[PDB]
């Protein structure tokens, strides 16, 4: 526990399809951070066949936010499972609300960096549609896209302004080619 609490922790925040997972995989290979995706954890619980998984599946297929306690407990347990060995943690897709950040800080520890993966709204819509047309997830349909984006703009963008009060946000232009985005992310990571 005091081990995870004192670890470097990076929050990765950005709209659906903005390129969070993409950039996080490149961080892992280059710097050796531990990548925890809130969405991957939740989808793994869905695939387990549990009753909790059936309810998560419903929530996610509607594009809605899973309750804080559910996602936070999964993230904590996944941090613990990898605590022995981390150079640091990339928490991808959490927090999605201010209260999510605040509870993570109370239970786990503070973020040193918030990578704000910043894509245009229409770029996200097009990206999520392109994925949807070629083997996307079940939530990559048009109607669910609308709800995922709405919640990002209303609930999640406030997270940026929140952690901007402590100067830890770095804005990453995720409209550039993947490798050019990564060069900006490297600049941010090297500050740690
Ligand atoms: N904290 C939380 N609290 C409550 N509920 C939660 C929660 N976390 C999750 N949930 C629930 O789970 C759901 C799923 O959430 P989750 O899976 O966490 O998040 P997401 O934002 O929906 O995941 P995406 O995979 O759509 O986006 P990504 O930004 O990682 O993009 P990627 O790199 O793949 O890239 C997308 C596409 O774009 C392309 N691309 C990426 N970067 C670039 C680039 N620079 N140039 C060109 N194309 C690019 C990629 O090839 C790819 O095709 C939520 O809606 C909610 O229901």
Numbering used by the authors: 2 to 193
Which passages does the manuscript contain on this structure?
AK is a small enzyme that catalyzes a reversible phosphoryl transfer reaction between ATP/AMP and two ADPs. The structures comprised the characteristic three-domain arrangement: the CORE (residues 1–38, 69–136, and 143–193), AMPbind (residues 39–68), and LID (residues 137–142) domains. The static CORE domain provides substrate-binding sites, and the dynamic AMPbind and LID domains close over the AMP and ATP sites, respectively, upon substrate binding. AK is a small protein that undergoes relatively large conformational changes upon substrate binding and product release, and has long been used as a model system for studying connections between structure, function, and dynamics.
To assess the structural basis of cold adaptation, we determined the crystal structures of AKNc and AKDr to resolutions of 1.99 and 1.75 Å, respectively, using molecular replacement. The three AKs from the tropical fishes including AKDr have Ile28, Ala48, and Lys188 at these positions, whereas AKNc has Val28, Ser48, and Thr188. In the structure of AKDr, the longer side chain of Ile28 enhances the hydrophobic contacts with the residues in β3 and α9, and interacts more closely with hydrophobic residues in β1 and β4. The reverse triple mutation significantly reduced the thermal stability of AKDr, as indicated by a decrease in Tm of 8.9 °C relative to the WT enzyme, confirming the importance of the CORE packing in the overall stability of the fish AKs. The AKDr mutant exhibited increased catalytic activities at low temperatures (5 °C and 35 °C) compared to the WT enzyme, and the temperature of maximum activity decreased (35 °C). In the crystal structure of AKDr, we identified a salt bridge connecting between Arg171 and Glu192, which is substituted to Ala192 in AKNc.
